[PDB]
Amino acid sequence: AQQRTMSENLRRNLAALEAKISEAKTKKNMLQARAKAAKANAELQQTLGGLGT
Amino acid sequence: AQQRTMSENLRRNLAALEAKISEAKTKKNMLQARAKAAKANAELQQTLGGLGT
């Protein structure tokens, strides 16, 4: 009875953790896209601008 | 008469000791199961938690 109770706690706590990890995989994929974009947006502005001589 | 009296004391005291030992064998078997379980329960929580940087 104690074992069956513990196994459920392990089974469903692991599932919650695996969900978070799973979020991290998807989050990394979209975060990567914007990480590229941000540098580009500044590039054009740095080239266009009158910054420095 | 003294021998027969002593032999009973030896026979039945040994039986009580062997019972305790026998308990220890069974107790070790179930204690081993929970010893594994306890570390696992903490593992998931340690990974999930915001403990440390």
Side-chain angles (χ1 to χ4, degrees):
Chain A
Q2 310 315 113
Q3 289 298 116
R4 290 176 301 199
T5 301
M6 289 187 295
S7 296
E8 288 284 294
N9 184 23
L10 292 172
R11 280 184 288 242
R12 302 162 70 171
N13 196 24
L14 179 60
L17 176 55
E18 175 172 3
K20 299 296 279 287
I21 292 168
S22 295
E23 290 177 5
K25 299 174 191 184
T26 291
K27 287 186 300 177
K28 180 272 305 305
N29 296 339
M30 57 173 181
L31 190 55
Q32 281 300 121
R34 305 189 294 272
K36 297 180 186 65
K39 307 175 165 75
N41 299 325
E43 313 275 331
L44 305 172
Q45 299 291 61
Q46 291 186 115
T47 309
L48 282 158
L51 300 312
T53 193
Chain B
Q2 310 315 113
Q3 290 298 116
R4 290 176 301 199
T5 301
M6 289 187 295
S7 296
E8 288 284 294
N9 184 23
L10 292 172
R11 280 184 288 242
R12 302 162 70 171
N13 196 24
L14 179 60
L17 176 55
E18 175 172 3
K20 299 296 279 287
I21 292 168
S22 295
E23 290 177 5
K25 299 174 191 184
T26 291
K27 287 186 300 177
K28 180 272 305 305
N29 296 339
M30 57 173 181
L31 190 55
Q32 281 300 121
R34 305 189 294 272
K36 297 180 186 65
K39 307 175 165 75
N41 299 325
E43 313 275 331
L44 305 172
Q45 299 291 61
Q46 291 186 115
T47 309
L48 282 158
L51 300 312
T53 193

PDB file of all heavy atoms in Angstrom, chain B residues 28-53:
ATOM      1  N   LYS B  28      14.766  -6.250   6.473  1.00  0.00           N
ATOM      2  CA  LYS B  28      15.798  -5.812   5.551  1.00  0.00           C
ATOM      3  C   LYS B  28      15.244  -5.719   4.147  1.00  0.00           C
ATOM      4  O   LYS B  28      15.487  -4.726   3.468  1.00  0.00           O
ATOM      5  CB  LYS B  28      17.038  -6.736   5.630  1.00  0.00           C
ATOM      6  CG  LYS B  28      18.217  -6.390   4.698  1.00  0.00           C
ATOM      7  CD  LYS B  28      18.190  -7.012   3.287  1.00  0.00           C
ATOM      8  CE  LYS B  28      18.067  -8.547   3.250  1.00  0.00           C
ATOM      9  NZ  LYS B  28      19.132  -9.207   4.041  1.00  0.00           N
ATOM     10  N   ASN B  29      14.443  -6.729   3.697  1.00  0.00           N
ATOM     11  CA  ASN B  29      13.847  -6.771   2.369  1.00  0.00           C
ATOM     12  C   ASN B  29      12.937  -5.592   2.094  1.00  0.00           C
ATOM     13  O   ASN B  29      13.016  -5.010   1.014  1.00  0.00           O
ATOM     14  CB  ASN B  29      13.010  -8.055   2.099  1.00  0.00           C
ATOM     15  CG  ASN B  29      13.896  -9.309   2.121  1.00  0.00           C
ATOM     16  OD1 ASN B  29      15.118  -9.234   1.941  1.00  0.00           O
ATOM     17  ND2 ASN B  29      13.251 -10.490   2.368  1.00  0.00           N
ATOM     18  N   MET B  30      12.041  -5.217   3.048  1.00  0.00           N
ATOM     19  CA  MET B  30      11.147  -4.096   2.830  1.00  0.00           C
ATOM     20  C   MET B  30      11.791  -2.750   3.071  1.00  0.00           C
ATOM     21  O   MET B  30      11.425  -1.769   2.428  1.00  0.00           O
ATOM     22  CB  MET B  30       9.826  -4.175   3.633  1.00  0.00           C
ATOM     23  CG  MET B  30       9.956  -4.284   5.161  1.00  0.00           C
ATOM     24  SD  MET B  30       8.343  -4.158   5.999  1.00  0.00           S
ATOM     25  CE  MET B  30       8.998  -4.304   7.685  1.00  0.00           C
ATOM     26  N   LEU B  31      12.764  -2.668   4.011  1.00  0.00           N
ATOM     27  CA  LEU B  31      13.517  -1.470   4.320  1.00  0.00           C
ATOM     28  C   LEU B  31      14.347  -1.031   3.135  1.00  0.00           C
ATOM     29  O   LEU B  31      14.436   0.160   2.846  1.00  0.00           O
ATOM     30  CB  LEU B  31      14.402  -1.663   5.573  1.00  0.00           C
ATOM     31  CG  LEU B  31      15.052  -0.375   6.127  1.00  0.00           C
ATOM     32  CD1 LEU B  31      14.015   0.723   6.431  1.00  0.00           C
ATOM     33  CD2 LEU B  31      15.872  -0.682   7.390  1.00  0.00           C
ATOM     34  N   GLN B  32      14.940  -2.008   2.399  1.00  0.00           N
ATOM     35  CA  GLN B  32      15.658  -1.805   1.158  1.00  0.00           C
ATOM     36  C   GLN B  32      14.841  -1.117   0.092  1.00  0.00           C
ATOM     37  O   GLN B  32      15.362  -0.245  -0.599  1.00  0.00           O
ATOM     38  CB  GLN B  32      16.300  -3.110   0.611  1.00  0.00           C
ATOM     39  CG  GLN B  32      17.616  -3.499   1.317  1.00  0.00           C
ATOM     40  CD  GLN B  32      18.658  -2.381   1.145  1.00  0.00           C
ATOM     41  OE1 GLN B  32      19.140  -1.822   2.138  1.00  0.00           O
ATOM     42  NE2 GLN B  32      19.002  -2.053  -0.136  1.00  0.00           N
ATOM     43  N   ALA B  33      13.550  -1.503  -0.074  1.00  0.00           N
ATOM     44  CA  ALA B  33      12.640  -0.892  -1.025  1.00  0.00           C
ATOM     45  C   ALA B  33      12.416   0.588  -0.772  1.00  0.00           C
ATOM     46  O   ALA B  33      12.442   1.387  -1.707  1.00  0.00           O
ATOM     47  CB  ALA B  33      11.265  -1.591  -1.026  1.00  0.00           C
ATOM     48  N   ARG B  34      12.200   0.992   0.505  1.00  0.00           N
ATOM     49  CA  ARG B  34      11.928   2.374   0.854  1.00  0.00           C
ATOM     50  C   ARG B  34      13.184   3.216   0.839  1.00  0.00           C
ATOM     51  O   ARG B  34      13.115   4.410   0.559  1.00  0.00           O
ATOM     52  CB  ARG B  34      11.282   2.482   2.256  1.00  0.00           C
ATOM     53  CG  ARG B  34      10.002   1.634   2.392  1.00  0.00           C
ATOM     54  CD  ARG B  34       9.208   1.888   3.684  1.00  0.00           C
ATOM     55  NE  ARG B  34      10.003   1.448   4.877  1.00  0.00           N
ATOM     56  CZ  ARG B  34       9.972   0.182   5.376  1.00  0.00           C
ATOM     57  NH1 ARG B  34       9.247  -0.801   4.794  1.00  0.00           N
ATOM     58  NH2 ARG B  34      10.679  -0.106   6.495  1.00  0.00           N
ATOM     59  N   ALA B  35      14.370   2.610   1.116  1.00  0.00           N
ATOM     60  CA  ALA B  35      15.662   3.268   1.055  1.00  0.00           C
ATOM     61  C   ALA B  35      15.968   3.788  -0.338  1.00  0.00           C
ATOM     62  O   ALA B  35      16.546   4.863  -0.482  1.00  0.00           O
ATOM     63  CB  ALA B  35      16.805   2.316   1.459  1.00  0.00           C
ATOM     64  N   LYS B  36      15.624   3.001  -1.398  1.00  0.00           N
ATOM     65  CA  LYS B  36      15.667   3.432  -2.786  1.00  0.00           C
ATOM     66  C   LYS B  36      14.711   4.575  -3.067  1.00  0.00           C
ATOM     67  O   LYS B  36      15.094   5.572  -3.677  1.00  0.00           O
ATOM     68  CB  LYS B  36      15.315   2.289  -3.772  1.00  0.00           C
ATOM     69  CG  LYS B  36      16.311   1.119  -3.741  1.00  0.00           C
ATOM     70  CD  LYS B  36      15.932   0.002  -4.727  1.00  0.00           C
ATOM     71  CE  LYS B  36      16.805  -1.258  -4.624  1.00  0.00           C
ATOM     72  NZ  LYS B  36      16.643  -1.928  -3.310  1.00  0.00           N
ATOM     73  N   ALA B  37      13.441   4.439  -2.605  1.00  0.00           N
ATOM     74  CA  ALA B  37      12.354   5.359  -2.872  1.00  0.00           C
ATOM     75  C   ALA B  37      12.604   6.751  -2.355  1.00  0.00           C
ATOM     76  O   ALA B  37      12.291   7.720  -3.039  1.00  0.00           O
ATOM     77  CB  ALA B  37      11.032   4.870  -2.247  1.00  0.00           C
ATOM     78  N   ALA B  38      13.155   6.872  -1.123  1.00  0.00           N
ATOM     79  CA  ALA B  38      13.416   8.129  -0.452  1.00  0.00           C
ATOM     80  C   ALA B  38      14.353   9.037  -1.225  1.00  0.00           C
ATOM     81  O   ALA B  38      14.116  10.239  -1.311  1.00  0.00           O
ATOM     82  CB  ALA B  38      14.031   7.898   0.944  1.00  0.00           C
ATOM     83  N   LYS B  39      15.412   8.461  -1.784  1.00  0.00           N
ATOM     84  CA  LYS B  39      16.384   9.229  -2.553  1.00  0.00           C
ATOM     85  C   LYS B  39      15.772   9.741  -3.852  1.00  0.00           C
ATOM     86  O   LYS B  39      16.065  10.852  -4.292  1.00  0.00           O
ATOM     87  CB  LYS B  39      17.621   8.379  -2.853  1.00  0.00           C
ATOM     88  CG  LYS B  39      18.251   7.745  -1.623  1.00  0.00           C
ATOM     89  CD  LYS B  39      19.400   6.826  -2.004  1.00  0.00           C
ATOM     90  CE  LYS B  39      20.262   6.491  -0.797  1.00  0.00           C
ATOM     91  NZ  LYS B  39      19.596   5.510   0.106  1.00  0.00           N
ATOM     92  N   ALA B  40      14.921   8.923  -4.462  1.00  0.00           N
ATOM     93  CA  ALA B  40      14.265   9.291  -5.711  1.00  0.00           C
ATOM     94  C   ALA B  40      13.319  10.469  -5.505  1.00  0.00           C
ATOM     95  O   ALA B  40      13.310  11.414  -6.294  1.00  0.00           O
ATOM     96  CB  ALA B  40      13.515   8.099  -6.287  1.00  0.00           C
ATOM     97  N   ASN B  41      12.525  10.405  -4.441  1.00  0.00           N
ATOM     98  CA  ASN B  41      11.575  11.466  -4.130  1.00  0.00           C
ATOM     99  C   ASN B  41      12.257  12.823  -3.995  1.00  0.00           C
ATOM    100  O   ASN B  41      11.704  13.849  -4.389  1.00  0.00           O
ATOM    101  CB  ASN B  41      10.802  11.136  -2.853  1.00  0.00           C
ATOM    102  CG  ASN B  41       9.996   9.857  -2.971  1.00  0.00           C
ATOM    103  OD1 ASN B  41       9.464   9.543  -4.037  1.00  0.00           O
ATOM    104  ND2 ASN B  41       9.903   9.112  -1.877  1.00  0.00           N
ATOM    105  N   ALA B  42      13.464  12.820  -3.437  1.00  0.00           N
ATOM    106  CA  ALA B  42      14.225  14.048  -3.250  1.00  0.00           C
ATOM    107  C   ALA B  42      14.887  14.486  -4.552  1.00  0.00           C
ATOM    108  O   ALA B  42      15.030  15.679  -4.817  1.00  0.00           O
ATOM    109  CB  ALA B  42      15.268  13.865  -2.158  1.00  0.00           C
ATOM    110  N   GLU B  43      15.289  13.512  -5.363  1.00  0.00           N
ATOM    111  CA  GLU B  43      15.937  13.794  -6.638  1.00  0.00           C
ATOM    112  C   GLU B  43      15.063  14.692  -7.508  1.00  0.00           C
ATOM    113  O   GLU B  43      15.484  15.771  -7.921  1.00  0.00           O
ATOM    114  CB  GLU B  43      16.252  12.491  -7.377  1.00  0.00           C
ATOM    115  CG  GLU B  43      16.914  11.432  -6.512  1.00  0.00           C
ATOM    116  CD  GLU B  43      18.418  11.598  -6.432  1.00  0.00           C
ATOM    117  OE1 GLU B  43      19.011  12.128  -7.395  1.00  0.00           O
ATOM    118  OE2 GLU B  43      19.009  11.198  -5.408  1.00  0.00           O
ATOM    119  N   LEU B  44      13.843  14.239  -7.781  1.00  0.00           N
ATOM    120  CA  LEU B  44      12.909  15.000  -8.600  1.00  0.00           C
ATOM    121  C   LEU B  44      12.737  16.416  -8.061  1.00  0.00           C
ATOM    122  O   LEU B  44      12.742  17.384  -8.819  1.00  0.00           O
ATOM    123  CB  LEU B  44      11.554  14.293  -8.665  1.00  0.00           C
ATOM    124  CG  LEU B  44      11.569  12.842  -9.154  1.00  0.00           C
ATOM    125  CD1 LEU B  44      10.200  12.204  -8.983  1.00  0.00           C
ATOM    126  CD2 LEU B  44      12.022  12.768 -10.604  1.00  0.00           C
ATOM    127  N   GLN B  45      12.584  16.526  -6.745  1.00  0.00           N
ATOM    128  CA  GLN B  45      12.412  17.819  -6.103  1.00  0.00           C
ATOM    129  C   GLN B  45      13.635  18.697  -6.213  1.00  0.00           C
ATOM    130  O   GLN B  45      13.494  19.896  -6.424  1.00  0.00           O
ATOM    131  CB  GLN B  45      11.982  17.696  -4.616  1.00  0.00           C
ATOM    132  CG  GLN B  45      10.634  16.973  -4.379  1.00  0.00           C
ATOM    133  CD  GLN B  45       9.430  17.791  -4.880  1.00  0.00           C
ATOM    134  OE1 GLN B  45       9.308  18.097  -6.071  1.00  0.00           O
ATOM    135  NE2 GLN B  45       8.501  18.135  -3.934  1.00  0.00           N
ATOM    136  N   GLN B  46      14.865  18.132  -6.064  1.00  0.00           N
ATOM    137  CA  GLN B  46      16.110  18.860  -6.232  1.00  0.00           C
ATOM    138  C   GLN B  46      16.264  19.412  -7.641  1.00  0.00           C
ATOM    139  O   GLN B  46      16.679  20.559  -7.807  1.00  0.00           O
ATOM    140  CB  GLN B  46      17.361  18.026  -5.870  1.00  0.00           C
ATOM    141  CG  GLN B  46      17.457  17.737  -4.360  1.00  0.00           C
ATOM    142  CD  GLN B  46      18.781  17.035  -4.025  1.00  0.00           C
ATOM    143  OE1 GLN B  46      19.626  17.597  -3.319  1.00  0.00           O
ATOM    144  NE2 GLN B  46      18.951  15.785  -4.548  1.00  0.00           N
ATOM    145  N   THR B  47      15.938  18.603  -8.688  1.00  0.00           N
ATOM    146  CA  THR B  47      15.973  19.012 -10.086  1.00  0.00           C
ATOM    147  C   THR B  47      14.945  20.087 -10.406  1.00  0.00           C
ATOM    148  O   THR B  47      15.253  21.050 -11.105  1.00  0.00           O
ATOM    149  CB  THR B  47      15.805  17.829 -11.031  1.00  0.00           C
ATOM    150  OG1 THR B  47      16.726  16.803 -10.684  1.00  0.00           O
ATOM    151  CG2 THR B  47      16.092  18.258 -12.489  1.00  0.00           C
ATOM    152  N   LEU B  48      13.684  19.919  -9.931  1.00  0.00           N
ATOM    153  CA  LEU B  48      12.596  20.866 -10.091  1.00  0.00           C
ATOM    154  C   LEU B  48      12.807  22.201  -9.436  1.00  0.00           C
ATOM    155  O   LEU B  48      12.483  23.231 -10.020  1.00  0.00           O
ATOM    156  CB  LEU B  48      11.284  20.292  -9.494  1.00  0.00           C
ATOM    157  CG  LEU B  48      10.591  19.254 -10.400  1.00  0.00           C
ATOM    158  CD1 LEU B  48       9.653  18.342  -9.593  1.00  0.00           C
ATOM    159  CD2 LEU B  48       9.824  19.947 -11.543  1.00  0.00           C
ATOM    160  N   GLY B  49      13.310  22.187  -8.178  1.00  0.00           N
ATOM    161  CA  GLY B  49      13.464  23.339  -7.320  1.00  0.00           C
ATOM    162  C   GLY B  49      14.396  24.379  -7.886  1.00  0.00           C
ATOM    163  O   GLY B  49      15.135  24.133  -8.840  1.00  0.00           O
ATOM    164  N   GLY B  50      14.374  25.585  -7.270  1.00  0.00           N
ATOM    165  CA  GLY B  50      15.178  26.724  -7.648  1.00  0.00           C
ATOM    166  C   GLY B  50      16.399  26.803  -6.794  1.00  0.00           C
ATOM    167  O   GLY B  50      17.021  27.861  -6.721  1.00  0.00           O
ATOM    168  N   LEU B  51      16.765  25.680  -6.120  1.00  0.00           N
ATOM    169  CA  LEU B  51      17.908  25.595  -5.245  1.00  0.00           C
ATOM    170  C   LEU B  51      19.172  25.869  -6.037  1.00  0.00           C
ATOM    171  O   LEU B  51      19.426  25.237  -7.062  1.00  0.00           O
ATOM    172  CB  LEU B  51      18.076  24.234  -4.508  1.00  0.00           C
ATOM    173  CG  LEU B  51      16.917  23.792  -3.568  1.00  0.00           C
ATOM    174  CD1 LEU B  51      16.439  24.901  -2.609  1.00  0.00           C
ATOM    175  CD2 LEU B  51      15.731  23.153  -4.315  1.00  0.00           C
ATOM    176  N   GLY B  52      19.983  26.835  -5.542  1.00  0.00           N
ATOM    177  CA  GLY B  52      21.235  27.278  -6.111  1.00  0.00           C
ATOM    178  C   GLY B  52      21.157  27.933  -7.466  1.00  0.00           C
ATOM    179  O   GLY B  52      20.083  28.074  -8.044  1.00  0.00           O
ATOM    180  N   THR B  53      22.336  28.384  -7.975  1.00  0.00           N
ATOM    181  CA  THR B  53      22.470  29.049  -9.254  1.00  0.00           C
ATOM    182  C   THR B  53      23.096  28.089 -10.250  1.00  0.00           C
ATOM    183  O   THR B  53      23.014  28.299 -11.459  1.00  0.00           O
ATOM    184  CB  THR B  53      23.291  30.330  -9.133  1.00  0.00           C
ATOM    185  OG1 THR B  53      23.174  31.134 -10.303  1.00  0.00           O
ATOM    186  CG2 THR B  53      24.787  30.057  -8.838  1.00  0.00           C
TER     187      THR B  53
END
